[PDB]
Amino acid sequence: MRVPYSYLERQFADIEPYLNDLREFIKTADFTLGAELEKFEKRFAALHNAPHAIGVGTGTDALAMSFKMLNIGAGDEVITCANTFIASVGAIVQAGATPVLVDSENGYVIDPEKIEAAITDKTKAIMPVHYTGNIADMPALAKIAKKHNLHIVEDACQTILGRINDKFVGSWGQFACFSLHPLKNLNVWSDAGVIITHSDEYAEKLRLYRNHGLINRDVCVEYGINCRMDTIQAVIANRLMNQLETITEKRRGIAHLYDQSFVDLSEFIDVPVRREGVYHVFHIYVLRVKYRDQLFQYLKDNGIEVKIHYPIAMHLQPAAKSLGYQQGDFPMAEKHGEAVITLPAHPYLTEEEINYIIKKVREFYLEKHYN
Numbered sequence: 001m002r003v004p005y006s007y008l009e010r011q012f013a014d015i016e017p018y019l020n021d022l023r024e025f026i027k028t029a030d031f032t033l034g035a036e037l038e039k040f041e042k043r044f045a046a047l048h049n050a051p052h053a054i055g056v057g058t059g060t061d062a063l064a065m066s067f068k069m070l071n072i073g074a075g076d077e078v079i080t081c082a083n084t085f086i087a088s089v090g091a092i093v094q095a096g097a098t099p100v101l102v103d104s105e106n107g108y109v110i111d112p113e114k115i116e117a118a119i120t121d122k123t124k125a126i127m128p129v130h131y132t133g134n135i136a137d138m139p140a141l142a143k144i145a146k147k148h149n150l151h152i153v154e155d156a157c158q159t160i161l162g163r164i165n166d167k168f169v170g171s172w173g174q175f176a177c178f179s180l181h182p183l184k185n186l187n188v189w190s191d192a193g194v195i196i197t198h199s200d201e202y203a204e205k206l207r208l209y210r211n212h213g214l215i216n217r218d219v220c221v222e223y224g225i226n227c228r229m230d231t232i233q234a235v236i237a238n239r240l241m242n243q244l245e246t247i248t249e250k251r252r253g254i255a256h257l258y259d260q261s262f263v264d265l266s267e268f269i270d271v272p273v274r275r276e277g278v279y280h281v282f283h284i285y286v287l288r289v290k291y292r293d294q295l296f297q298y299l300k301d302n303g304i305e306v307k308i309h310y311p312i313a314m315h316l317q318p319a320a321k322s323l324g325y326q327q328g329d330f331p332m333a334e335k336h337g338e339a340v341i342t343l344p345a346h347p348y349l350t351e352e353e354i355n356y357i358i359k360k361v362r363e364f365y366l367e368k369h370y371n
C-alpha cells in the first residue's frame with residue numbers, strides 16, 4: 001500500500017462545483033478586494049468569535065504587518081520559540097525586529113517558564129506559536145505579558161479553529177495570524193494570510209496598509225504595501241470552509257486513535273500530553289520516537305509518506321548564525337530534531353490506510369526492525 005501525505009488530489013477531486021463557482025465569479029470581474037473577500041472575512045472572523053478578519057497576502061506577511069501596526073521594528077526584540085517553522089522567525093526579521101528564542105515544552109509549544117529569563121529592555125512582544133495545531137499556554141503567557149507590559153501576537157498559522165475552552169485563538173494577542181496556503185485544514189489554491197483582531201482601529205489601519213495606504217483611488221493617507229488576499233481565492237475558501245469544522249474534528253479523531261494505538265509502546269513512542277481544555281487542531285501529527293531515522297526509512301519502504309517537521313532547529317539554521325546561539329541552548333528543540341516523525345493523519349485517509357499506518361508503526365518496534 002502507498003499512503004499519501006498530501007490529500008489535495010482527493011480533496012479537490014470533486015472539482016466541477018469549484019469551477020462552476022469560478023465560471024460565475026469571472027463574469028463579475030471582481031478581482032481586487034471584492035465582495036467575495038468581504039464575505040470570506042466575515043465568516044472567518046465569526047469562526048473565532050472575533051469582530052474583524054483582514055485577508056492579506058500570506059501568513060508570514062500577516063505576522064510582519066501585525067508588528068508594523070504595533071510599531072515593533074528596528075531596535076526591538078520579539079520573543080518566540082526555537083521550535084517552529086522558519087516563517088515564524090522570518091516574520092520578525094521582516095518587520096526589522098530582533099528575534100529572541102526560548103525552548104519548547106512537552107507539546108511542541110513555547111515553554112512559559114522560560115520566557116521571563118529572555119526578557120530585556122528591548123523586548124516589545126511575545127509571539128507564541130500554536131505549533132502543530134497545539135495551543136500555547138495563553139493564560140500563562142498573558143500573565144507574563146501583562147507583568148512586563150509586552151504585546152502579544154499569536155502565530156496561529158497552523159491553527160484555524162484553535163481554542164482553549166471559552167476562548168478562541170486571538171483572545172489574548174492584539175492580533176492572531178493565520179495561513180490558507182496548502183496544506184491547511186482550510187486551504188485555497190495559492191498563498192493567502194488572515195489577521196484577526198478585536199481592535200476597530202487596528203482593523204481599519206490594516207485595511208489601509210494592505211492596499212497602498214489608499215483610502216480611495218485618489219488619496220494615499222500613509223505609505224502602505226500591496227498585500228491583500230485575492231478575491232478569487234476567497235471564492236475557493238468560501239466553498240471549502242463549508243467542510244472546515246468536520247475536517248478539523250475528524251482530524252482530531254484520527255489523532256486520538258493514534259494516541260490510543262501507541263499507548264502501550266511508551267518505551268519507543270512518546271505521545272505528547274494533551275492539555276485539558278485545549279482544542280488542538282492537529283495540523284500535523286507529531287511523535288517523538290526511538291530509532292527515528294530507522295523507523296522513517298522503514299515506513300517509507302512500506303509505502304507510507306512520513307515526514308520530519310523538522311530536523312534542524314531554528315537556532316541551528318545557517319540563517320540564525322548571527323543570533324549567537326549554540327547547540328545545547330535549547331535541549332527540547334534539539335531533541336525534537338533528533339526524535340520527531342510526522343504520520344499522515346488527514347481526514348481524507350481511508351480506514352484501511354489509517355489501520356495500515358498503525359500496523360506498520362507497531363510492527364517496526366514489536367518485530368525489532370531497529371536491530
Ligand SMILES: Cc1ncc(COP(=O)(O)O)c(CN)c1O
Pocket residue numbers: 058059060061084085087088129131155157158178179180181191192193
Ligand atoms: C508556524 C507557522 N507560522 C507561519 C507560517 C507562514 O504561513 P504562510 O506560508 O502563509 O506564509 C507557517 C506556514 N504556513 C507556519 O507553519
Ligand code: NA
Pocket residue numbers: 105109110111112136137
Ligand atoms: Na504549555
Ligand code: NA
Pocket residue numbers: 183184185283
Ligand atoms: Na492540513
Ligand code: NA
Pocket residue numbers: 189190230232233
Ligand atoms: Na491567486
